[PDB]
Design a protein around this ligand. Sequence first.
Ligand SMILES: [Cl-]
Ligand SMILES: [Cl-]
Length: 334
Amino acid sequence: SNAMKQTVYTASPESQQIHVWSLEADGKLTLVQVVDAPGQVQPMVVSPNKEFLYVGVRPEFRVLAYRITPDNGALTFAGEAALPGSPTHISTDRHGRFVFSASYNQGCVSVTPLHDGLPGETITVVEGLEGCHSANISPDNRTLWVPALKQDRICLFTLSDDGFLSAQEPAEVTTVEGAGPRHMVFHPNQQYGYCVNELNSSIDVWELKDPKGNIECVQTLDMMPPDFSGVRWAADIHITPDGRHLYACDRTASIITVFSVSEDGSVLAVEGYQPTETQPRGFNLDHSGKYLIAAGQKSHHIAVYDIVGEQGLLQEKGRYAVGQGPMWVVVNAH
Ligand SMILES: [Cl-]
Ligand SMILES: [Cl-]
């Protein structure tokens, strides 16, 4: 048993709801709360100190702060701040002092300061990042990695102590033409990053510091079955905290591709394909890495899977109704 007590948060923008579930060590979910958001909530992130759930809402572009009740993970609206564009992805720095928002439509990444955990007036906005789709702080907290999907690049910005962003040298790393870099995760060992490319459903493995001190792409892998000929539409990517397994999903095929991760994190290998909730845009892993929770944007349900064996293949355990068009999942241990 993972001996953990956890909460699962899901975003259902088409019904303007956030669902809160208690997740027991045995994988069973129980509904804790349903929140009516003041608009369509899409991205969500738990603060590093676990006091808040920060979420992105439209059409009144904002990051909303919901205070988390420690015992059961329930939410209470606590504050908000305006954003310069519709939030596509939300995250924080390693120390929970800033919220980063990537806006696809406004092609920008912005920084929101936190004061006693509450979001304040935007302190900077970096525009000109067409298709800006995520902002991902490096393991060492110095560099914000920002996929610009329509520019086939991941922009690299130094984050100052005061929350400002400015281009590094080099200012970016590039993907193959038309790949459409979207979401990424870093290996727990802090040495590699993994980016899922939407438009060609591929995963790029990025070495963060090679012997010359440079960032290099050291592997590119197709996440689709060899017999796939449809429209590639990849979405999310997550790695288990034990570093053994990596998962990515495609919205057209409605699959989660299962990858093994070499011991040093430098090599991925496809282990299998798991049919999942229809049109999976968002999923996540629990804090133990024993469970994967996937949302179906066209199923209106989440599915809980056991992660099993040395390959990390998935075995469905349960299925739960959420709101309409669920597309974001996060899990908090407490
Ligand atoms: Cl630099
Ligand atoms: Cl250094």
